[PDB]
Amino acid sequence: NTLQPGCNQACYDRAFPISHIRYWVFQIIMVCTPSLCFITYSVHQSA
Amino acid sequence: NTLQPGCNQACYDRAFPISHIRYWVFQIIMVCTPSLCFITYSVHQSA
């Protein structure tokens, strides 16, 4: 509720510094990473 | 600086409850009144 240009952008950035979806995507990939490490090590060990 | 309907009216009314011009008009007429009283009394006295 304002007439000031740029207030919307600053206020949204302050309210939601990082969106939930991006945090969750990062978490999912990071949590899957160790399984990838183990699988790649297993592949390397054989041949 | 707002998007709220009616904010302009309320804020103007609070800032300037009575305009200077109307106060000055009232003052001028009121200050002239006693001379009017004296003149009308003088007219009444004669005839």
From Swiss-Prot, chains A, B:
Write down what this protein is called: Gap junction delta-2 protein
Query: Quaternary structure?
Result: A connexon is composed of a hexamer of connexins.
- UniProt organism field: Homo sapiens (Human)
Q: Which residues of the full protein are shown?
A: 56 to 102 of 321
Q: Where in the cell is it found?
A: Cell membrane; Cell junction, Gap junction
Lineage top rank: taxon: Eukaryota
TM spans (from-to) = 21-43
In this entry, the parts of the chain located on the Extracellular side of the membrane are 1-20
- Could you tell me in which tissues this protein is expressed? Highly expressed in neurons.
Q: What is stated as this protein's family in its record?
A: Belongs to the connexin family. Delta-type subfamily.
Q: What does this protein do?
A: One gap junction consists of a cluster of closely packed pairs of transmembrane channels, the connexons, through which materials of low MW diffuse from one cell to a neighboring cell.
